């Protein structure tokens, strides 16, 4: 059954609630973004209204075959009325098409649901600046001070400089990037751009990227693996065995692989700066784990919530253990005492 933190009180609405069958009393289902833990359950057989961004709606239609008559895309930054209730979609700074949802309840209560997000000061000058928020349904993925990582721009600078140096030293090196979902496209796009290549990938991944409104994509991506020296592979193949096997398939065009595995946070963040990151190497294969996150660091999260000053916080991540819930609640009270709300 649908958990309480997916239900918006005072409405008929749910958020990211497709894996529970028909939800009792739900008249409209919102989807914040196209990640499988959130869309799980959607198909051609779904016959209730789904509200989402334009990009998420293109993905629903083409990848899951949801019928067009049930897809209700909404423009961003625009007040819309859904089943009698004013809503706004805002950019979440997560993966392509990902949104936060502002609900203006009939009784005067204002609710923000972040979906998954990477908090940023730029959000302090969106339509959030203009009213009070009573309830915040918060992506608490990295809600503890140990979770530190660099800016996405510093991680991309490292990746571009590493790839450009390796291929300039050896024009016969191949670059490989791992993926398993949408998001983190800057990693493979910025490396291809510095090297003067397109990114080569499977037909299924190409189809997924063509759903995304990224300008000049016919320009950066391809299914012709032979024409490309940046290849995208499933994340499970980014290991010495899978990479050795890929290099055989390339028919003697290449004699070295440099690979990237974008992860979120890992514990080597506690000890090493991005500048000082080194690979794992076996023979002519080197693998870099790079901390490219599409979720808030602790500090970014704390800044956003201290600016917003909500009256009540509802965590949507790490809710399954008493120790996780108690730790998160202790941090929310510190933040509130420090900032004075
Ligand atoms: Ni996500």
UniProtKB/Swiss-Prot annotation:
Tissue-specific expression: Expressed in brain, heart, kidney, liver, pancreas, placenta and skeletal muscle.
List the subcellular locations. Answer: Nucleus
| Domain of life, source organism | Eukaryota
Explain the induction of this protein.
During mitosis. The mRNA encoding this protein contains an internal ribosome entry site (IRES) in its 5'-UTR. This 5'-UTR generally suppresses translation while specifically promoting expression during mitosis, when cap-dependent translation may be impaired.
The subunit field of the Swiss-Prot or TrEMBL record says: Binds constitutively to TP53BP1. Binds CDC27, which is itself a component of the anaphase promoting complex (APC). Binds PIAS1.
**What family, per the record?**
Belongs to the DNA repair metallo-beta-lactamase (DRMBL) family.
Q: What does this protein do?
A: May be required for DNA interstrand cross-link repair. Also required for checkpoint mediated cell cycle arrest in early prophase in response to mitotic spindle poisons. Possesses beta-lactamase activity, catalyzing the hydrolysis of penicillin G and nitrocefin. Exhibits no activity towards other beta-lactam antibiotic classes including cephalosporins (cefotaxime) and carbapenems (imipenem).
Identify this protein by name. DNA cross-link repair 1A protein
Species the sequence originates in? Homo sapiens
Q: What is the lineage of its organism?
A: Eukaryota, Metazoa, Chordata, Craniata, Vertebrata
Instruction: Give the stretch of the parent protein shown, with its full length.
Output: 700 to 1040 of 1040
């Amino acid at each position: 059954t649908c958990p309480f933190y997916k239900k918006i009180p005072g409405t008929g609405f749910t958020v990211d609630a497709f894996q529970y069958g028909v939800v009792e009393g739900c008249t409209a289902y919102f989807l914040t973004h196209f990640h499988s833990d959130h869309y799980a359950g959607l198909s051609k057989h779904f016959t209730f209204p789904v509200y989402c961004s334009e990009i998420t709606g293109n993905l629903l239609k083409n990848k899951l075959h949801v019928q067009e008559q049930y897809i209700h895309p909404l423009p961003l930054d625009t007040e819309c009325i859904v089943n009698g209730v004013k809503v706004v979609l805002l950019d979440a700074n997560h993966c392509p098409g990902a949104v936060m949802i502002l609900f203006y309840l009939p009784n005067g209560t204002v609710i923000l649901h972040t979906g998954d997000f990477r908090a940023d000061p730029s959000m302090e000058r969106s339509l959030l600046a203009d009213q009070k928020v009573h309830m915040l349904y918060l992506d608490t993925t990295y809600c503890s001070p140990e979770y530190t990582f660099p800016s996405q721009q510093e991680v991309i600078r490292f990746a571009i400089n590493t790839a450009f140096e390796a291929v300039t030293l050896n024009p016969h090196a191949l670059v490989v990037c791992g993926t398993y979902s949408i998001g983190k496209e800057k990693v493979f796009l910025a490396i291809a751009d510095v090297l003067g290549s397109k990114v080569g990938m499977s037909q299924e991944k190409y189809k997924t990227l063509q759903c995304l409104n990224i300008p000049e994509i016919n320009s950066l991506i391809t299914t012709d693996m032979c024409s490309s020296l940046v290849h995208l592979l499933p994340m499970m193949q980014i290991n010495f065995k899978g990479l050795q096997s890929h290099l055989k398939k390339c028919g003697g065009k290449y004699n070295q692989i440099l690979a990237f595995r974008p992860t979120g946070w890992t514990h080597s963040n506690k000890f090493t700066r991005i500048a000082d990151v080194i690979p794992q190497t076996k023979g002519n294969i080197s693998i870099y784990g790079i901390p490219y996150s599409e979720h808030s660091s602790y500090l970014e999260m704390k800044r956003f919530v201290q600016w917003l000053k909500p009256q009540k916080i509802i965590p949507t991540v790490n809710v399954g253990t008493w120790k996780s819930r108690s730790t998160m609640e202790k941090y929310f009270r510190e933040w509130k005492l420090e900032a004075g709300y």
